[PDB]
Amino acid sequence: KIVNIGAVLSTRKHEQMFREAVNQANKRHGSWKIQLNATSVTHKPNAIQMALSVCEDLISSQVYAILVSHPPTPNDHFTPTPVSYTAGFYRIPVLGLTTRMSIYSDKSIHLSFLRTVPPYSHQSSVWFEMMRVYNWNHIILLVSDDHEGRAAQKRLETLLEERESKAEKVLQFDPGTKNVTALLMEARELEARVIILSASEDDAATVYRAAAMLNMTGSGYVWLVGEREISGNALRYAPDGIIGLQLINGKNESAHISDAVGVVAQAVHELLEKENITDPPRGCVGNTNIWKTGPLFKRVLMSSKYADGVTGRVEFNEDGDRKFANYSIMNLQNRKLVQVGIYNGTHVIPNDRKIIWPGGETEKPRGYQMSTRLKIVTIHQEPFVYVKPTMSDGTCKEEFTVNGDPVKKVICTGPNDTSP
């Protein structure tokens, strides 16, 4: 008869905001006679003792849904995984609020890890929409990771299939090494200078150091990065004029927690509107009964439409993401984040500021060289392409025609025969 809400939350002002939101969640959400109590955990350095305290708060209390709201994790793991896996044992989804990786987007490892934040494929879509403004076609892709890199490459190929075009060159290597200068030198001799980076913080710092040692901050270089490349030392090693992205009402913790409690409480009351109300079992002795209303709760949550929120109109898609995300296109002008544009879900509106690039003027970086190096291929046709061996070494004898036209020979590279 008692209902406890699982909340991994420890900051006391957000504890008061959580208690106020729990008090407000039972006021106008119907005349149903259920009550909601809070259950919070404290700080631990590890994640296994955190998971122990969480699961002791979960299984021995017959919880409904879990909210994890710690983006400053004390370790470098950044894992909401154990609480989500604990609830996914009982087929219970967890609405995570911190991570945005594409390894959490897969429905094979994380079966029901839902979230109200979009992954980096939406940032790749914003980059593709910025390609549609200045008519960008040939791009260079550099991805260090492999978990999110396959999803980012699949989304980029999907967007280029929507354009019905092709990419120029993609790069996927092993992080940790420092011999990434030769790959950047091979990427220098391509047909374009548009650089797109999708990596972690240390890999972004490594490729920024490699670009600084090779002087890739000259004219025409397109610098368009996201969130992980403007944090930490990658913010320090970035050149002046690099373009990044900023979350609108994403770093604001209290309004995000209040909107998350509102969405979760509206989902719980929507599940309580219909029949087949089941509770998770205990874990003491001799009852291994599974939770039977898994697909029912999935049909409730995955097909839910919302209209309330301080951040904005939240709506869960087929992957459990955020629709119409407000972004801030930011510029790093002399180690200072300068607001140079904002982003609704359908259109980009720059402000009255100047978009200063590390290349030329405030327009798009002229990094197009697909006409200054053309590999002219031809076949040995008898009337069309006469191929003649040189006299001594690489010279062309200027033959004379009958109409006064000198034979303008070109120094080509001709083979003698085929492979047999």
Partner: protein, 353 residues
């Protein structure tokens, strides 16, 4: 090394043989800290799992966990993946829900499972269908995840078929049963084998709809994998006569041999790692107040008791032992088919209808 073994109540396997497995065995023990802790838990729950993690890892640095599950979910093994993501302890998936086949693992995780993947299981099922001369088949797949690789493997098999497999188009079920539009999809199925890839209760509903409409004849066969059928203890209602399941839940097969092969592979890995690096215990000590050498890409070339117990690149055995069971009229599941190293063995030549 110190390896703790925990079991439940699957296949009437007790706990005293886990104590007897340490005494006369393990003669060539190159590590000196080789001890076992045999445990039993009545319920399957993550609370007791994290409790035994924080009580046994602090218990003289146990770097081995064996768990026996009796549920119908592979994500229980994903719980062990959290042991593989923080402490980086290699755990061998032995039997039950801790070793069921999922879609895509991660190379950074040191977790392993015992069994063949869904592509090799589909290869075994198509070898069964080729040996029984059942050419025309169907494919009914729901919106349950892990469906792209299976349908893609069937498409690449039919498009590169030496036999000429007549593949019916994919029957998709986006919603539940309505008997308005799915009835047309059920009436178009006139094949012999009706393939199914979904959950347990959805399979019960589809077989009940097929029984209520007369789609469960002798010509209409039903071949299911281990993910659709599940364990052999719980048998729900509305199952047609002629259900052939492919799984590994065998009653007379020794779980003691499974845990003995697991301990042999882990002690072989520890003995091969002792000759390379000195400090073999290098992991998280205890759950109170916070990798360099792992055993993920090191015990691939393992061989215990002469059997091919080597590891694949995805975290599976190279040649496991597949089980093919049938459903008779006596509401029982009897083992029929087993898989060899390279080819496929068939016990019953004359196939009953």
């Amino acid at each position: 090394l110190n390896i703790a073994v925990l079991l439940g109540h699957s296949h009437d396997v007790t706990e005293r043989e886990l104590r007897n497995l340490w005494g006369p065995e393990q003669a060539t023990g190159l590590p000196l800290d080789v001890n076992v802790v045999a445990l039993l838990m009545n319920r399957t729950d993550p609370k007791s799992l994290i409790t035994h993690v924080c009580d046994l890892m602090s218990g003289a640095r146990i770097h081995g966990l064996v768990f026996g599950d009796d549920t119908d979910q592979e994500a229980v093994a994903q719980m062990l993946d959290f042991i593989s993501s923080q402490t980086f302890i290699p755990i061998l998936g032995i039997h039950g829900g801790a070793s069921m086949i999922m879609a895509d693992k991660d190379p950074t995780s040191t977790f392993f499972q015992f069994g063949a993947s869904i592509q090799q299981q589909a290869t075994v099922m198509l070898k069964i269908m080729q040996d029984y001369d059942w050419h025309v088949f169907s494919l009914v797949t729901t919106i349950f995840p892990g469906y792209r690789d299976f349908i893609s493997f069937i498409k690449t098999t039919v498009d590169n078929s030496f036999v000429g497999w007549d593949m019916q188009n994919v029957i998709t079920l986006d919603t539940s049963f309505e008997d308005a539009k799915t009835q047309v999809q059920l009436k178009k199925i006139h094949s012999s084998v009706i393939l199914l890839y979904c959950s347990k209760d959805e399979a019960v509903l589809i077989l009940s709809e097929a029984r209520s409409l007369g789609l469960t004849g002798y010509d209409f066969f039903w071949i299911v994998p281990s993910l659709v059928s599940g364990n052999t203890e719980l048998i729900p209602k509305e199952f047609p006569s002629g259900l052939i399941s492919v799984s590994y839940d065998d009653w007379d097969y020794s779980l003691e041999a499974r845990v003995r092969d697991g301990l042999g592979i882990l002690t072989t890995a520890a003995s091969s790692m002792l000759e390379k690096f000195s400090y073999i215990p290098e992991a998280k000590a205890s759950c109170y107040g916070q990798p360099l050498h792992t055993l993920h890409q090191f015990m691939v070339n393992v061989t215990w008791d002469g059997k091919d117990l080597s590891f694949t690149e995805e975290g599976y055995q190279v040649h496991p032992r597949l089980v093919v069971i049938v459903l008779n009229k006596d509401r029982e599941w009897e083992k029929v088919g087993k898989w060899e190293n390279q080819t496929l063995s068939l016990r019953h030549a004359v196939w009953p209808r």
